[PDB]
């Protein structure tokens, strides 16, 4: 003697195939789905992925890497060629330091 | 590893091993026989026969069936079920 | 000839040596009849809603749904804080945490005091 | 736990014991001749008191038989390489594809195999043509207010197919 | 940086004044264009950060996360159809513009300079997540999910504001540089303990730490796929980014006051990897997986080694990609059967014989197969914590074992052994889900080749 | 030796064509088992040489 | 009169996707690799000299590779 509802019986399971056997991703509009495929590849791989692969495969020395290689090369060659010990400890000059006293 | 089984062939192999069995005769050995009516042998040696088929062909048959074969034709039918006998 | 197969929480008791299967009263016959009847009706409903040629979706078992809703969402109702619940809660939730806490204090105070002495093997320990 | 009735019986219970003990005696006993000897010995041991008009002493001897069996089984009972438990256990299940597929193919490949799909389509029309009336009338027609069995009657009425047969007939071929 | 801000704005009236079968191409195409546009950013070098204005700047912590955001938007926007294409046009447009405003506040948040501005953009990151998951939460408790969500995030993130205003009017302005160059150490009075506790506890809530992870599982099992990917990847690594910055201040008391949180994180990492071994609701296993990886993140943040921060940022980016991918695969399976449960949908090595390739690939990244980034992260964090103590490797290795076993259980449970053969409705794989998998797992392997980009400031 | 290093690195890299081959072919080669067997044989004959140089 | 009929899931949609993927990466995988091969076979990398006396460079004229 009661129902509490009035709506459609749910769901309506649409196979997105069985009206298009050629169909790509979304709903049954035929051509613009092919455009979706073509844009998400051709502007998603064909312009993004391989160009990003080149662009990050090399660029300059990110955080000064090979600069540091050759700079350390020249500095250690200098500190061999002038006798003084390589990598002096006490990186700041002890003449320009002032210990507080007791 | 697939020689094809066929219905005449499975009939011949099953009747070969029944005929080799001792306490039956090669005279009253029919395809449409009974292990209960006319061969008259007991349930015990009936399951010895079931053991012979399992040990020849290489697979168990379950005890839901070994109650209820009781004739050679249904034996051939049941290995036809397990093997799906067409080429 | 045999010590009669003491069971466990792991070793299942097999079908043969129950020995309750041999005291068949009429109640066990009654129970096995009704249990077969229940299995019969459920396979009937399932097979009719399994072999429909129009039935596109899945058969949507209420048993699995009922188990899942019992397992996750029907925990927090229902509950009362008992002695057993509170006791096991503070044991298996706080016990290991506070134990691991004290042992890492102990290891860290050892290593801090020991390198405060300076006699540790950090002659070259750069990758800290 | 079986589809036909509510229990095995005494008879088939003893029978399954005899099958198991004979199988374990295979798994214990190589060389096949001493196997044959011990098999006839075991058959004689069941022949000693086959003909008890008693029943309660028979089932007590059944229980003591199960004790001396389970004491004397094998660590690897010889399971066949087709049985569950065994070496196969749906071994070539890699290709046991159900046949609700193969209709969701692109019509290029439905052009690749034409006759098969024509006859498959008349199979599905055979199914739907006799689905409603005969099958569901035969199911809601015969049984008791509860079904209380797991068998089902055949279609002895006149013509067409026994009910509820599609997933029985259309199965994998067990060696593809 | 306004060169990135303003086309992300102007992608919004785009979506309004396009029509049916016309919004989609514009949004997706132009969002990919913005992805190239921020691939242009990565210049960052040497001495310091790089300053995009008197107002914006980029640390090299912020560059990979920012590029990850602008990568993850078009993927998401393709991913969130077929479960709403049959709803109305106006509601669909509102959905797309909601995500674009979301991305806009995420870029605002990652390129912050002032921590107060960071806080405003933190909760402006919050409010679209709420509206998406509540309006399309798609199950009966999306109510409770949103409610738990917003009250945990605000009521944890509320006193963080008070602590930052107090620091503002005790140490001048709040550039990250003038937070640096002027920070002086602060000793162990109890006010310092509460101030540290306020800041670190708000971001602890947003990671999650272990005692506050039941924020998470409702807020991912009852979300749509877009908000789930957003929430997992961008929001959890956003919380980690915040703690990574503001841990620059208050180093002289973090040692004395960091002991309970590490131990909470370790025993909770073990417990969370254990609790995702036995649950149903396959969608939630990825959520508890995410709590496991974030617990390892928190271990890496509270220990303060440069080794630890390198491992932390790599673990951030790799787990973001893994979890976002794996959520998208679980949505594919739920589009197949209307279950969400684990033990139901089975088989599928036979059917869809290349969906399983993507399941295998993501499952082995979540295993941390070794050339991938996630092993780089986990390995350096284990190295840094073993230099922290000679004992913690029991916990890390046992995490590795249980992580292996639940991840493999996800693989071979639902997609191995036997189809239940009363399914008979699953379609062969669309091009779209294959495209989504392709957009996840090309950059993960491409960073697996050359990973010197994604390591942190302490490179 | 340039011969030594050259032959060892090509014993590596000969095991790298066929995976990329059927990842890139999509026209199902009938000769695929024969192909993998013959590249393993060629890797063998390249690997016999520098080991004998090593013992030499 | 020997052969049987296997039951496959499909080949169509799967091989169509992979064919599209190799075509749409390869359509700019090929000309870029051709381009960079022409770059390091014609245009030169760079040379390793030092700072000329009183001639400040650009912020380029600093790097080995010409595309960088
Ligand atoms: C530029 C880089 C990307 C280029 C991709 C171009 C397209 C390649 C393609 O279509 O390949 C066909 C192949 C599918 O082959 P199919 O014949 O169509 O069907 C095979 C079945 O589906 C069955 O699937 P399956 O057996 O092919 O799945 C195997 C799966 C299993 O994964 C693994 O084995 C990973 C562990 C590898 C060893 C680690 C040491 O993947 C691999 O073996 C990949 C190993 C290489 C990863 C590291 C490089 O595509 C894929 O496997 C998907 C792409 C996977 C990434 C490729 C990255 C290459 C670098
Ligand atoms: C958790 C509460 C965090 C409140 C903000 C952080 C803070 O400064 O707390 C210290 C506050 C108050 O400490 P306080 O900030 O007044 O510290 C003393 C500051 N002088 C010396 C300038 C007066 O602690 C609480 O209110 C306890 C809660
Ligand atoms: C470290 C940081 C920890 C921060 C913790 C903050 C509080 C925790 C989250 C509060 C909200 C909890 C929640 O959502 O609970 C659900 C409950 C409503 O549930 P129910 O009673 O079923 O109502 C159904 C209505 N038809 O909701 C309620 O009953 C809400 C009750 C009020 C909560 C307001 C927020 C907290 C304020 C605390 C002030 C002291």
Asked whether residue A11 is assigned to any structural domain, the reply reads no
Tokens 């264009």 belong to which residue? E33
Annotated domain spans of chain B? 9-83
Which chain E residues touch A15 with a CB distance below 8 Å? 425, 427
Beta bridge partners of E57: E51
Tally of structural domains, chain D: 2
How big is chain G, counted in residues? 68
Active-site residue B42, yes or no?
yes
Asked whether residue A37 is assigned to any structural domain, the reply reads yes
Residues D73 and D129 both lie in one domain: no
Which chain C residues touch D146 with a CB distance below 8 Å? 37, 40-41
C4, C14, C40 member nearest D149 (Cβ): C40
Contact status, residue D162 vs residue D154, Cβ threshold 8 Å: yes
Tokens 């026989």 belong to which residue? B33
3-state secondary structure chain B: CCCCCCHHHHHHHHHHHHHHCCCCCCCCCCCCCCCCCCCCCCHHHHHHHHHHHHHHHCCCCCHHHHCCCCCHHHHHHHHHHHHCCCC
Asked whether residue D109 is assigned to any structural domain, the reply reads yes
Neighbours of E137 (CB within 10 A): 21
DSSP at G39 = I
Asked whether residue D157 is assigned to any structural domain, the reply reads yes
CA angle D40, D42, D47 (to 5 degrees): 90
Tokens 């932390």 belong to which residue? E312
Which tokens belong to E103? 């991305």
Residues 6 or more apart in contact with residue A45 via CB below 8 angstroms: E438, E442, G21, G24, G25
A18: nearest CA partner in chain D:
D104
Residues D101 and D168 both lie in one domain: yes
Asked whether residue A5 is assigned to any structural domain, the reply reads no
- Of D48, D77, D106, the position where a domain reaches its end is D77
Instruction: For residue E195, give the ligand nearest its CA.
Output: 2
Residues D103 and D165 both lie in one domain: yes
Which tokens belong to C72? 């996750």
**CA atoms of D63 and D51, how far apart (whole Å):** 17
**CA atoms of B64 and A8, how far apart (whole Å):** 48
Best mutation target, G4, G12, G14, G17, to test chain D (most D CBs within 10 A): G12
Which chain G residues touch A49 with a CB distance below 8 Å? 25
Do the Cβ atoms of B51 and D3 come within 8 Å?
no
Which tokens belong to C37? 């009847």
Domain that holds residue D27: 8-77
Query: Among residues 16-55 of chain G, which lie with CB inside 8 Å of chain F?
Result: 18-19, 22
- CA terminus-to-terminus distance, chain B: 14
**CA atoms of B16 and B26, how far apart (whole Å):** 10
Do the Cβ atoms of D105 and G6 come within 8 Å?
no
Burial status of residue C54 (CB atoms within 10 A of its CB: 0-12, 13-18, 19 or more): exposed
Do the Cβ atoms of D104 and A22 come within 8 Å?
no
**CA atoms of B69 and B52, how far apart (whole Å):** 14
Contact status, residue E351 vs residue E332, Cβ threshold 8 Å: no
**CA atoms of E354 and G14, how far apart (whole Å):** 7
Contact status, residue E281 vs residue E139, Cβ threshold 8 Å: no
* R_g (Cα) of chain A, nearest Å: 35
Contact status, residue E291 vs residue E208, Cβ threshold 8 Å: yes
**CA atoms of F39 and F19, how far apart (whole Å):** 12
Asked whether residue A69 is assigned to any structural domain, the reply reads yes
Give DSSP secondary structure letters for C2-71.
-------SSS---SSS-SGGG---HHHHHHHHHHHHHHHHHHHHHHHTTS-TT--S----HHHHHHHHHH
Asked whether residue D146 is assigned to any structural domain, the reply reads yes
Contact status, residue D53 vs residue D81, Cβ threshold 8 Å: no
- Indicate whether residue E393 lines ligand 3 (CB < 6 A): no
Give DSSP secondary structure letters for A42-97.
HTTTTTTHHHHHHHHH--S-TTSHHHHHHHHHHHHHHHHHT-SPSS-SSSS-GGG-
**CA atoms of E181 and E302, how far apart (whole Å):** 22
Asked whether residue A25 is assigned to any structural domain, the reply reads yes
Ligand 3 mean position to E233 CA, how many Å?
Answer: 26
Beta bridge partners of E9: none
Question: What's the CATH architecture for B9-83?
Answer: Orthogonal Bundle (1.10)
Residues D14 and D70 both lie in one domain: yes
DSSP at E210 = G
Asked whether residue D2 is assigned to any structural domain, the reply reads no
**CA atoms of D148 and D126, how far apart (whole Å):** 30
Residues D58 and D110 both lie in one domain: no
**CA atoms of A3 and E437, how far apart (whole Å):** 45
- Three-state SS for F21? helix
**CA atoms of E119 and E161, how far apart (whole Å):** 7
Q: Report phi then psi at E51, rounded to 5.
A: -100, 110
**CA atoms of E405 and B39, how far apart (whole Å):** 60
**CA atoms of C95 and C89, how far apart (whole Å):** 9
Residues D109 and D73 both lie in one domain: no
Catalytic residue among B42, B55, B63, B81: B42
Do the Cβ atoms of G32 and A60 come within 8 Å?
no
Residues D167 and D107 both lie in one domain: yes
Which tokens belong to E30? 């132009």
**CA atoms of B36 and B67, how far apart (whole Å):** 12
Chains in touch with B (3+ beta-carbon pairs under 8 Å) read: D
Q: What number of C-beta contacts closer than 8 Å exist between C and E?
A: 59
Distances in Å between the Cα of A101 and the Cα atoms of A98, B39, E127, E140 are 9, 120, 58, 72
Residues D51 and D106 both lie in one domain: no
- CA terminus-to-terminus distance, chain C: 67
The structure was resolved to a resolution in Å of 4.2
Domain that holds residue A70: 17-102
H/E run at residue E14: helix E12-16
Residues D68 and D113 both lie in one domain: no
Residues 6 or more apart in contact with residue E452 via CB below 8 angstroms: A62, A65, E459
Tally of structural domains, chain A: 1
**CA atoms of E60 and E455, how far apart (whole Å):** 8
């Amino acid at each position: 003697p009661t129902l509490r509802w009035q709506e459609d019986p749910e769901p309506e399971d649409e196979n997105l195939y069985e009206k298009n056997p050629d169909s790509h991703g979304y709903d049954k509009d035929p051509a613009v789905d092919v455009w979706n495929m073509r844009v998400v590849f051709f502007f998603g791989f064909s312009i993004v992925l391989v160009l990003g692969s080149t662009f990050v495969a090399y660029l300059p020395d990110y955080r000064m890497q090979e600069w540091a290689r050759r700079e350390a090369e020249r500095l250690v060659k200098y500190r061999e060629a002038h006798g003084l010990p390589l990598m002096e400890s006490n990186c700041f000059d002890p003449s320009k330091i002032q210990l507080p006293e007791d | 590893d697939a020689p094809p089984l066929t219905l005449e062939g499975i009939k011949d192999r099953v009747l070969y091993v029944l005929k080799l069995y001792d306490k039956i005769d090669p005279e009253k050995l029919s395809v449409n026989s009974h292990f209960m009516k006319d061969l008259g042998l007991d349930s015990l040696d009936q399951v010895e026969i079931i053991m012979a088929m399992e040990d020849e062909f290489g697979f168990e048959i379950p005890d839901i069936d070994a109650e209820k074969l009781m004739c050679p034709q249904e034996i051939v039918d049941y290995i036809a079920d397990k093997k799906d006998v067409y080429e | 000839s045999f010590p009669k197969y003491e069971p466990s929480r792991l070793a299942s008791l097999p079908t043969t040596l129950d020995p309750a299967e041999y005291d068949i009263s009429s109640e066990t016959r009654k129970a096995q009849a009704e249990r077969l009847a229940i299995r019969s009706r459920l396979k009937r409903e399932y097979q009719l809603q399994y072999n429909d040629p129009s039935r596109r979706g899945v058969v949507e078992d209420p048993a699995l749904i009922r188990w899942t809703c019992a397992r996750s969402a029907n925990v927090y109702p229902n509950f009362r804080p008992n002695t057993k619940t509170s006791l096991l809660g503070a044991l298996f939730g706080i016990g290991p945490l506070i134990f691991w806490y004290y042992v890492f204090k102990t290891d860290r105070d050892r290593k801090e005091k020991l390198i405060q002495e300076g006699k540790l093997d950090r002659t070259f320990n750069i990758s800290y | 736990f079986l589809p036909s009735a509510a229990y095995l019986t005494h008879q088939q219970k003893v029978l399954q014991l005899y099958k198991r003990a004979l199988r374990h005696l295979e798994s214990r006993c190589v060389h096949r001749d001493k196997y044959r000897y011990f098999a006839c010995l075991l058959r004689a041991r069941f022949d000693e008191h086959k003909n008890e008009k008693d029943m309660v002493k028979a089932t007590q001897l059944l229980r003591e038989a199960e004790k001396e069996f389970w004491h004397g089984q094998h660590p690897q009972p010889y399971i066949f390489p087709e049985s569950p438990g065994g070496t196969s256990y749906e071994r070539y299940e890699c290709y046991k594809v159900p046949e609700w597929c193969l209709d969701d193919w692109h019509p290029s490949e439905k052009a690749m195999y034409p006759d098969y799909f024509a006859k498959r389509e008349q199979w599905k029309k055979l199914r739907r043509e006799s689905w409603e009336r005969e099958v569901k009338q035969l199911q809601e027609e015969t049984p008791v207010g509860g079904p209380r069995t797991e068998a089902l009657p055949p279609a002895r009425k006149q013509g067409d197919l026994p009910p509820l047969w599609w997933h029985i007939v259309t199965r994998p071929r067990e060696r593809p | 940086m306004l060169k990135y801000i303003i086309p992300t704005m102007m992608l919004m009236p785009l979506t309004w004044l396009s029509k049916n079968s016309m919004i989609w191409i514009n949004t997706t195409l132009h969002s990919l264009l913005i992805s190239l546009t921020s691939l242009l950013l990565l210049n960052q070098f040497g001495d310091n950060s790089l300053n995009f204005s008197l107002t914006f700047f980029s640390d090299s912590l912020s560059t990979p996360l920012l590029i990850l955001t602008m990568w993850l938007l078009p993927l998401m926007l393709m991913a969130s159809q077929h479960h709403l294409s049959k709803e109305n046009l106006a509601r669909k447009k509102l959905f797309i513009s909601m995500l674009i405003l979301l991305q806009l506040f995420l870029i605002m948040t990652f390129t912050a300079t002032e921590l107060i501005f960071f806080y405003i953009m933190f909760e402006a990151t919050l409010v679209p997540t709420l509206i998406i998951i509540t309006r399309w939460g798609n199950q009966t408790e999306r109510l409770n999910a949103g409610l738990y969500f917003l009250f945990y995030t605000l009521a944890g993130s509320l006193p963080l504001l008070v602590a930052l205003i107090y620091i503002q009017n005790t140490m001048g302005s709040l550039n990250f540089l003038i937070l640096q160059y002027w920070v002086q150490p602060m000793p162990n009075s109890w006010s310092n303990t509460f101030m540290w506790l306020a800041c670190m506890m708000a971001f602890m809530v947003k990671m999650p730490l272990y005692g506050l992870h039941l924020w998470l599982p409702k807020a991912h099992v009852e979300a749509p796929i877009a908000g789930s990917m957003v929430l997992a990847a961008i929001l959890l690594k956003l919380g980690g980014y915040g703690m990574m910055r503001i841990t620059l201040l208050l180093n002289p008391i973090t040692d004395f006051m960091a002991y309970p949180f590490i131990m909470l994180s370790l025993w909770g990492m073990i417990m969370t990897s254990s609790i995702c071994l036995r649950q149903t609701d396959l969608k939630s296993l990825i959520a508890y997986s995410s709590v496991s990886h974030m617990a390892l993140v928190i271990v890496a943040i509270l220990i303060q080694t440069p080794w630890s921060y390198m491992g932390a940022t790599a673990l951030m980016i790799a787990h973001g990609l893994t979890s976002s991918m794996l959520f998208c695969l679980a949505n594919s399976n739920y589009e197949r059967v209307h279950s969400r449960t684990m033990i139901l949908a089975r088989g599928l090595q036979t059917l869809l014989p290349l969906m399983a390739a993507w399941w295998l690939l993501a499952s082995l990244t979540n295993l941390a197969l070794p050339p991938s980034i996630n092993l780089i992260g986990e390995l350096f964090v284990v190295m840094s914590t073993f230099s922290w103590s000679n004992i913690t490797i029991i916990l890390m290795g046992l995490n590795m074992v249980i992580t292996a076993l639940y991840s493999l259980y996800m693989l071979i449970t639902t997609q191995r052994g036997k189809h239940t053969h009363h399914i008979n409705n699953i379609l062969p794989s669309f091009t779209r889900e294959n495209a989504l998998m392709s957009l996840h797992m090309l950059p993960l392997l491409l960073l697996s080749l050359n990973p010197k980009i994604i390591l942190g400031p302490l490179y | 030796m340039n011969l030594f290093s050259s032959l060892t690195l090509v014993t590596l890299i000969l095991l790298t064509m066929p995976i990329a081959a059927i990842n890139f072919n999509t026209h199902k080669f009938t000769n695929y088992p024969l192909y993998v067997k013959t590249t393993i044989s060629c890797a063998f004959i390249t690997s016999m040489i520098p080991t004998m140089m090593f013992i030499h | 009169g020997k052969r049987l009929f296997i039951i496959k899931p499909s080949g169509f949609y799967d091989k169509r996707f992979l064919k599209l993927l190799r075509f749409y990466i390869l359509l700019t995988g090929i000309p870029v690799v051709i381009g960079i091969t022409l770059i390091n076979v014609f245009i030169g990398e760079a040379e390793l000299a030092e700072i000329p006396e009183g001639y400040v460079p650009e912020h380029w004229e600093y790097f080995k590779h010409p595309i960088s």
